[PDB]
Amino acid sequence: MINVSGFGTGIVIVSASSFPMGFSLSKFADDESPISSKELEPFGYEMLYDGGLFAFDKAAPLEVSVSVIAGSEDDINLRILLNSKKGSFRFLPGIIPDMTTLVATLPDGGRTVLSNGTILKGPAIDTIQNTGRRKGNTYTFVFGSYLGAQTA
Amino acid sequence: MINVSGFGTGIVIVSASSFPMGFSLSKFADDESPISSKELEPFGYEMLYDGGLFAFDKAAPLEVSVSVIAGSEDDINLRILLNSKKGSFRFLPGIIPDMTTLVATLPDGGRTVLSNGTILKGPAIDTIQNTGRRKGNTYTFVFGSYLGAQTA
Amino acid sequence: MISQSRYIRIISGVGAAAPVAGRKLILRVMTTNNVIPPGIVIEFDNANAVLSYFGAQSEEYQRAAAYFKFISKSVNSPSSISFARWVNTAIAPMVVGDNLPKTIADFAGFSAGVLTIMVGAAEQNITAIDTSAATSMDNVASIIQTEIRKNADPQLAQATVTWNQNTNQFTLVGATIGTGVLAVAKSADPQDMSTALGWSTSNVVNVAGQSADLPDAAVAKSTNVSNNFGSFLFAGAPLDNDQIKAVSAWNAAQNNQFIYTVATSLANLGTLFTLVNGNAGTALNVLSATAANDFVEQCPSEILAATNYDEPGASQNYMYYQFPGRNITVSDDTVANTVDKSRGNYIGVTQANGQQLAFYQRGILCGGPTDAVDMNVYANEIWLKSAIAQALLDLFLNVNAVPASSTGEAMTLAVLQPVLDKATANGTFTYGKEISAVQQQYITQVTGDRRAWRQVQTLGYWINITFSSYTNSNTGLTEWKANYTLIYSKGDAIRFVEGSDVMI
Amino acid sequence: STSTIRTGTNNDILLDDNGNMVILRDVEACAQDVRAAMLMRTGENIFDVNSGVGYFEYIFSPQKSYDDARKSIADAILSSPDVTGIEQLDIDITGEVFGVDAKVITIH
Amino acid sequence: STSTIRTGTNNDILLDDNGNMVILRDVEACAQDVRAAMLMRTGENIFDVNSGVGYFEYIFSPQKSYDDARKSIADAILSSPDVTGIEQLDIDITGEVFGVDAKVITIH
């Protein structure tokens, strides 16, 4: 028996300037996927004219998507994060403005940290379905470096 | 009466450097296809100015997809393989550094071996679906040697 | 003012340096020289070392000098050689224990109370020996010999001593022949010779008196000491037919492990071939009666030792290699046909009156119908067996357990994969050859699976592993064993060329 | 346009019954010449080194590609006074023998 | 095309038993010369500054890339009279030792 349930997970987001101390996400939407990501492609390959195979190394980013219930506190926090403009304030050399760090805790105890990245797209105003309710707002991040710690 | 069941299939992966001894996979995901591949295309053709036909050889790779239950030990092992960096591992070049060999067994006794290849792409963090489950991770390999083992 | 070697160190070294680890295919020479102890094998890396150890007048120096100076098509050299002793007749017990240049005549001031302890059949001690003079090491050797003769023990009543100079050892010799054991021990006396002398200190070679033995027993014991060689040889006087037949049979007892090379004359081939039909692994070479021997029998050994197996394109032919030093034996078609029918090897001359061409012609090797005949196939099988065995032992020593299930056989395939890749890149396997109907039937008979001949035609090999149960002879219990079968297409080399041209 | 002296299956002058050396005209002279050229080996022609077939370096010795032997034989077939071009070359290398087959083109 | 005087494991003139200095011919002279050049270090050669190996600037001192050390060593191996090109260079850096390995190519 393997328990793959996602209930009880939590997210903490820390921003360099806008949110120096960080906040927490707890209200995850229902109709859309709570946490989603794209595939990682750090390797590539090329063919030689004799029929052989050659494999090299490629640079690849990491994209993450989260969704929350409209009207909750987490939604407006993420809206502030999105509306923050990188033109203002300053930065240490080679650091990127607003280096946002994300820490995700799995219910069993394992967790992961992601750094060197920022939010890049989200909704601005609420959407209304024909059924008469509001869509779950979804936001997309990107990250350059990550880690793995799956023991607890 | 021909038995085409896939129960009891085992797969062993051995790596040149990261896993010199190798490990085995036994926990295959449920919703995704446990193992699949694209069609080999090793021949080509072109139409002649007269109206005839001409055929010729062509270079062609092989791609394999493997899916496992999230959170299992096998997921951790393939995550290690994916995270291994090709640029490191100072070693004799031109032999596809960190070559990986895969051996798969069928319930009847059929055995197939594939060499000259490496892992290509896969997920980085777990995914949550609207039902509350964790999606089965999928990984993609590539191989160059089509070693024709189909023993009975 | 402190030294370079504490911070920076460069070893340099001339080119063509190839570090190697694994089985070595090098010549082993069984000699009747007195200097070599019966139970020890010695390895040299240069002709100069052999010269220093043995001396110019020795036959062994000439053999080594001829052996080392050789270049293959790809520039390579044997880079090693080994020696071993065969006792022809009964010998007295003896001891020897020095290798390092300890002898600089330090016997001065050591005269008082010499109490070296000789542990023979019965414990006995020596009396005071005068060494304060220290005039010459042979003189003090004679002094020690006389003092030993002063004892009444039957072995020490006629003992002798000897000191060699180019090498630095001190040797004792027993009186009787074929029986007896000697030993030497140190004592608490501060000024004792045994500590200063070679024997009774750390690595010391001891010898037990014992009767004469057949050559096959000697080579068997030598292998039991160590087996890191290939293509052994007997030096010195030629052996009679019966001894050669016995050695050939013993070599055939082992399955493709070494090559037995011998020298013989034209008149003698009629006898040997009838005696040594079959018995694979034996090479016959023709020797010239008129001229000097020139050591013709070493040629296959040099060719084999020069071979490098890790790099691609390794398999080489034996038909066309030129030895300028050697002489010429045959020059006619009739004698060549007779020798070929007798399965002999030689250096045949194609011409005079201009630059000469001669080469070690036949790469054939006597053996039964089933076993491989060509030399290159034999060498490739030797290397393949060594590699397979090493891989299997590595598997057993590394994994904690090998279950008797499909996982275990998968592990075995995974381990054997790199060896087969190295072999197919090397050249011992071949692809694309045509398969005759009788050959296809033979393949299907050997392995119960049909359509394996297609596999060996395309890739060049076919493998399968299964496991079963059995009971061993030593203990009534039962264990589990794994069985595999390997079929591959033999390598080949060009011997004869066919041509034709048409004007239109 | 060429001519030579007839030789037998061995490379010696062959005389007819009358005891007269015969001067072969074209075509047949070309066949004799190409046979001799392919049989002549490298390193033998004094006053012209680097001409002939490099048997011992390119065929008998263990080799990587075997294209070099084909080039050498193709050159040897050429350089004949009358030969124009080569139509076929096979290099069977089947079994134990090293098969070779060719068909050339002359002006006549 | 080069020559020099033989020296021992320490960099002093070594004499044979006969008491005669030996002038090494090519190949071996190349090995001796390349060892000496790699052992020289920069900064002390009067009449030619900026030649040698920058040990104290590029290896022993804390560094960022370590490419500069490779460039300097490659240059030092070159400038020998006979050396043509470098086949391999490793630069291991394992533990405390700074491994260096090279294979050089000469005309002869």
mmCIF file with all atom_site columns, N, CA and C in Angstrom, chain C residues 4 7-15, chain E residues 11 27-28 31-32 35 38-39 55 60:
data_model
loop_
_atom_site.group_PDB
_atom_site.id
_atom_site.type_symbol
_atom_site.label_atom_id
_atom_site.label_alt_id
_atom_site.label_comp_id
_atom_site.label_asym_id
_atom_site.label_entity_id
_atom_site.label_seq_id
_atom_site.pdbx_PDB_ins_code
_atom_site.Cartn_x
_atom_site.Cartn_y
_atom_site.Cartn_z
_atom_site.occupancy
_atom_site.B_iso_or_equiv
_atom_site.pdbx_formal_charge
_atom_site.auth_seq_id
_atom_site.auth_comp_id
_atom_site.auth_asym_id
_atom_site.auth_atom_id
_atom_site.pdbx_PDB_model_num
ATOM 1  N N  . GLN C 1 4  ? 63.404 20.616 -4.464  1.00 0.00 ? 4  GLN C N  1
ATOM 2  C CA . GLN C 1 4  ? 62.297 20.676 -5.404  1.00 0.00 ? 4  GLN C CA 1
ATOM 3  C C  . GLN C 1 4  ? 61.260 19.597 -5.159  1.00 0.00 ? 4  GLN C C  1
ATOM 4  N N  . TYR C 1 7  ? 57.814 20.022 -3.211  1.00 0.00 ? 7  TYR C N  1
ATOM 5  C CA . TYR C 1 7  ? 56.684 20.779 -3.741  1.00 0.00 ? 7  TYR C CA 1
ATOM 6  C C  . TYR C 1 7  ? 56.286 20.382 -5.151  1.00 0.00 ? 7  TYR C C  1
ATOM 7  N N  . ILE C 1 8  ? 57.245 20.127 -6.035  1.00 0.00 ? 8  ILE C N  1
ATOM 8  C CA . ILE C 1 8  ? 56.960 19.824 -7.431  1.00 0.00 ? 8  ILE C CA 1
ATOM 9  C C  . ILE C 1 8  ? 57.693 18.549 -7.811  1.00 0.00 ? 8  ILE C C  1
ATOM 10 N N  . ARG C 1 9  ? 57.001 17.648 -8.503  1.00 0.00 ? 9  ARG C N  1
ATOM 11 C CA . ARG C 1 9  ? 57.587 16.379 -8.910  1.00 0.00 ? 9  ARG C CA 1
ATOM 12 C C  . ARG C 1 9  ? 57.089 16.026 -10.300 1.00 0.00 ? 9  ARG C C  1
ATOM 13 N N  . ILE C 1 10 ? 58.016 15.832 -11.233 1.00 0.00 ? 10 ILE C N  1
ATOM 14 C CA . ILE C 1 10 ? 57.701 15.417 -12.594 1.00 0.00 ? 10 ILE C CA 1
ATOM 15 C C  . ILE C 1 10 ? 58.453 14.127 -12.870 1.00 0.00 ? 10 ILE C C  1
ATOM 16 N N  . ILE C 1 11 ? 57.731 13.099 -13.312 1.00 0.00 ? 11 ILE C N  1
ATOM 17 C CA . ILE C 1 11 ? 58.364 11.799 -13.495 1.00 0.00 ? 11 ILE C CA 1
ATOM 18 C C  . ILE C 1 11 ? 58.927 11.648 -14.902 1.00 0.00 ? 11 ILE C C  1
ATOM 19 N N  . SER C 1 12 ? 58.366 12.356 -15.877 1.00 0.00 ? 12 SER C N  1
ATOM 20 C CA . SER C 1 12 ? 58.817 12.313 -17.276 1.00 0.00 ? 12 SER C CA 1
ATOM 21 C C  . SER C 1 12 ? 58.733 10.867 -17.759 1.00 0.00 ? 12 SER C C  1
ATOM 22 N N  . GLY C 1 13 ? 59.725 10.360 -18.461 1.00 0.00 ? 13 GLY C N  1
ATOM 23 C CA . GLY C 1 13 ? 59.669 9.032  -19.031 1.00 0.00 ? 13 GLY C CA 1
ATOM 24 C C  . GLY C 1 13 ? 59.475 9.083  -20.535 1.00 0.00 ? 13 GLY C C  1
ATOM 25 N N  . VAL C 1 14 ? 60.203 8.215  -21.239 1.00 0.00 ? 14 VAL C N  1
ATOM 26 C CA . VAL C 1 14 ? 60.128 8.193  -22.694 1.00 0.00 ? 14 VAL C CA 1
ATOM 27 C C  . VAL C 1 14 ? 58.741 7.732  -23.129 1.00 0.00 ? 14 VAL C C  1
ATOM 28 N N  . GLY C 1 15 ? 58.396 8.051  -24.371 1.00 0.00 ? 15 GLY C N  1
ATOM 29 C CA . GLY C 1 15 ? 57.102 7.708  -24.912 1.00 0.00 ? 15 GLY C CA 1
ATOM 30 C C  . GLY C 1 15 ? 56.880 6.209  -25.009 1.00 0.00 ? 15 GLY C C  1
ATOM 31 N N  . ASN E 2 11 ? 68.908 17.739 -11.001 1.00 0.00 ? 11 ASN E N  1
ATOM 32 C CA . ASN E 2 11 ? 69.267 18.450 -12.222 1.00 0.00 ? 11 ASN E CA 1
ATOM 33 C C  . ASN E 2 11 ? 70.735 18.872 -12.175 1.00 0.00 ? 11 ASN E C  1
ATOM 34 N N  . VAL E 2 27 ? 64.679 12.805 -29.384 1.00 0.00 ? 27 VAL E N  1
ATOM 35 C CA . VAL E 2 27 ? 63.699 12.042 -28.614 1.00 0.00 ? 27 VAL E CA 1
ATOM 36 C C  . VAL E 2 27 ? 64.010 12.147 -27.128 1.00 0.00 ? 27 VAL E C  1
ATOM 37 N N  . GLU E 2 28 ? 65.083 11.491 -26.684 1.00 0.00 ? 28 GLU E N  1
ATOM 38 C CA . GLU E 2 28 ? 65.445 11.558 -25.271 1.00 0.00 ? 28 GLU E CA 1
ATOM 39 C C  . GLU E 2 28 ? 65.784 12.984 -24.865 1.00 0.00 ? 28 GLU E C  1
ATOM 40 N N  . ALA E 2 31 ? 62.618 14.757 -24.219 1.00 0.00 ? 31 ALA E N  1
ATOM 41 C CA . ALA E 2 31 ? 62.040 14.482 -22.908 1.00 0.00 ? 31 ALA E CA 1
ATOM 42 C C  . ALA E 2 31 ? 62.743 15.285 -21.825 1.00 0.00 ? 31 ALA E C  1
ATOM 43 N N  . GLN E 2 32 ? 64.076 15.271 -21.834 1.00 0.00 ? 32 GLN E N  1
ATOM 44 C CA . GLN E 2 32 ? 64.816 16.039 -20.840 1.00 0.00 ? 32 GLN E CA 1
ATOM 45 C C  . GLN E 2 32 ? 64.471 17.519 -20.923 1.00 0.00 ? 32 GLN E C  1
ATOM 46 N N  . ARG E 2 35 ? 60.899 18.319 -19.665 1.00 0.00 ? 35 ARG E N  1
ATOM 47 C CA . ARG E 2 35 ? 60.852 18.269 -18.208 1.00 0.00 ? 35 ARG E CA 1
ATOM 48 C C  . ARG E 2 35 ? 61.461 19.527 -17.606 1.00 0.00 ? 35 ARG E C  1
ATOM 49 N N  . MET E 2 38 ? 59.159 22.559 -18.099 1.00 0.00 ? 38 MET E N  1
ATOM 50 C CA . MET E 2 38 ? 58.017 22.553 -17.193 1.00 0.00 ? 38 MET E CA 1
ATOM 51 C C  . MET E 2 38 ? 58.434 22.848 -15.762 1.00 0.00 ? 38 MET E C  1
ATOM 52 N N  . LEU E 2 39 ? 59.683 22.570 -15.406 1.00 0.00 ? 39 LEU E N  1
ATOM 53 C CA . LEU E 2 39 ? 60.142 22.780 -14.039 1.00 0.00 ? 39 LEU E CA 1
ATOM 54 C C  . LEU E 2 39 ? 60.691 24.176 -13.782 1.00 0.00 ? 39 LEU E C  1
ATOM 55 N N  . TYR E 2 55 ? 53.411 29.618 -11.490 1.00 0.00 ? 55 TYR E N  1
ATOM 56 C CA . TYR E 2 55 ? 52.901 28.806 -10.392 1.00 0.00 ? 55 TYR E CA 1
ATOM 57 C C  . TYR E 2 55 ? 52.228 29.670 -9.336  1.00 0.00 ? 55 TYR E C  1
ATOM 58 N N  . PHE E 2 60 ? 49.062 27.984 -7.237  1.00 0.00 ? 60 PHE E N  1
ATOM 59 C CA . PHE E 2 60 ? 49.088 27.973 -5.781  1.00 0.00 ? 60 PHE E CA 1
ATOM 60 C C  . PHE E 2 60 ? 48.117 28.988 -5.195  1.00 0.00 ? 60 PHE E C  1
#
